[PDB]
């Protein structure tokens, strides 16, 4: 079940990104809405859900991937994005 | 080959990734389900199978590609991925 809050984890490489996504979706009730190949090795995984769930999920994901591969770049939470920012956010992963 | 465990190896360059894939699929009963060009030189190869098979396969693959080319970045196992993560996992190479 999706929600209003947004959780984002950026990693160097794909393996830590997948580990982070697994930990996030296991930890709390969040929906994985995107895995973005940013370029230059950056991978970002985005989740949506209610605020407490996203908070818990992002904390779990940050803990899980920090020692995997080249590790974690950023873990970020936005409790409510501006309505304009929704246009640059994926709805479902590809 | 059945089982839902996931094994992942990430390398710098394609040659160590191919060597890792060869070693993994020779070592144990796993299916090669994808090779991904991450960008910036990263390459990731993914295998599926039973938990013990994936453990053996990932260990063999990490051993084989360690000193090949620019080397190994990550070697990781997830015994059971969440159903959400399946949507970002390739099914066939």
């Amino acid at each position: 079940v999706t929600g209003i809050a947004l959780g984002m984890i950026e990693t160097r490489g794909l393996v830590p990104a997948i580990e982070a996504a697994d930990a996030m979706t296991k930890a709390a009730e969040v929906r994985l809405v995107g895995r973005q190949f940013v370029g230059g090795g950056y991978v970002t995984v985005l989740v949506r859900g209610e605020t407490g769930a996203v908070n818990a999920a992002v904390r779990a994901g940050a803990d899980a991937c920090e020692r995997v591969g080249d590790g974690l770049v950023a873990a970020h939470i936005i409790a409510r994005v501006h309505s304009e920012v929704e246009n640059i956010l994926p709805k479902a992963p590809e | 080959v059945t089982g839902i465990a996931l094994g992942m190896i990430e390398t710098r360059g394609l040659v160590p990734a191919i060597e890792a894939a060869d070693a993994m699929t020779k070592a144990a009963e796993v299916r090669l389900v994808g090779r991904q060009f991450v960008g910036g030189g990263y390459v990731t190869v993914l295998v599926r199978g039973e938990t013990g098979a994936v453990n053996a396969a990932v260990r063999a693959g990490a051993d084989a590609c360690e000193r090949v080319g620019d080397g190994l970045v990550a070697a990781h196992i997830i015994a059971r991925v969440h159903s959400e993560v399946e949507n970002i996992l390739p099914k066939a190479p």
């Binding site: 591969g69 | 396969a57 990490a62």
Partner: peptide, 20 residues
């Protein structure tokens, strides 16, 4: 004592129950 693929890549794998 027990040989085989389980003795390979010590200290390189990160998904294992020991790692977690």
């Amino acid at each position: 004592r027990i040989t085989g693929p389980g003795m390979l890549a010590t200290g390189l794998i990160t998904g294992t129950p020991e790692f977690r």
